[PDB]
Amino acid sequence: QVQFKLVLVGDGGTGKTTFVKRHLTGEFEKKAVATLGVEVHPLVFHTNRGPIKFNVWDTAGQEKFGGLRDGYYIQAQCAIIMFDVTSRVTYKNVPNWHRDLVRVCENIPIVLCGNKVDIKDRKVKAKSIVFHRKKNLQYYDISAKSNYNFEKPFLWLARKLIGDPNLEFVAMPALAPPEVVMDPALAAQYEHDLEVA
Numbered sequence: 001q002v003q004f005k006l007v008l009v010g011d012g013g014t015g016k017t018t019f020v021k022r023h024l025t026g027e028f029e030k031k032a033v034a035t036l037g038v039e040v041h042p043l044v045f046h047t048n049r050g051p052i053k054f055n056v057w058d059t060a061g062q063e064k065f066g067g068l069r070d071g072y073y074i075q076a077q078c079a080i081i082m083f084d085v086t087s088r089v090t091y092k093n094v095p096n097w098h099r100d101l102v103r104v105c106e107n108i109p110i111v112l113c114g115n116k117v118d119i120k121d122r123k124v125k126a127k128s129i130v131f132h133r134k135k136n137l138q139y140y141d142i143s144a145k146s147n148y149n150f151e152k153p154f155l156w157l158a159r160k161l162i163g164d165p166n167l168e169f170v171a172m173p174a175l176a177p178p179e180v181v182m183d184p185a186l187a188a189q190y191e192h193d194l195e196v197a
């Protein structure tokens with residue numbers, strides 16, 4: 001099996017758990033790692049080069065209280081760092097999480113995700129999201145609650161990890177039905193604003 005340890009980090013409350021849970025079979029099949037305070041969710045995706053499994057390591061909330069134990073990060077092959085676009089301080093802490101990752105991890109592919117784009121009053125707009133430029137990381141807006149752009153971080157990671165910039169998903173995973181509607185007009189403007197930066 002081609003599988004990848006994916007660590008999912010960022011401040012408490014940014015929507016990490018809600019995000020990983022959109023993949024329904026991953027949530028149904030999640031495996032507890034009680035010795036590290038983690039649930040490993042097997043998010044399978046199907047590509048033109050075959051199935052790939054991201055074993056997404058989701059914390060049990062201990063990030064609220066500081067850095068995670070080395071065992072959490074150890075042998076990660078990729079990461080998503082998340083922040084919440086309605087909470088400036090979570091964008092503020094992104095270089096900190098990054099530093100943890102670079103410190104424990106073997107120079108892995110990292111996607112930065114700004115979550116909760118469905119909330120009307122958005123604080124962290126495209127113009128201010130600059131950290132990924134400084135580090136040549138990929139950034140995406142996401143909304144966990146509406147599945148908006150769910151697949152995009154994993155698509156980017158898979159391209160990087162397999163070293164095939166032409167890899168495509170042949171089908172979408174079964175996702176939890178949207179719990180809020182992400183206005184497609186709002187979504188298109190946000191995509192625009194990110195290009196206009």
Ligand SMILES: Nc1nc2c(ncn2[C@@H]2O[C@H](COP(=O)(O)OP(=O)(O)O)[C@@H](O)[C@H]2O)c(=O)[nH]1
Nearest residue numbers: 011012013014015016017018019116143144145
């Ligand atoms: N509106 C909205 N709320 C969200 C989204 N993702 C998470 N939340 C809410 O934000 C809070 C924290 O989510 P959680 O997944 O526990 O965050 P974590 O602590 O990073 O694992 C919860 O109240 C979620 O319902 C989202 O995409 N949109």
Ligand SMILES: [Mg+2]
Nearest residue numbers: 016017059061
């Ligand atoms: Mg959580």
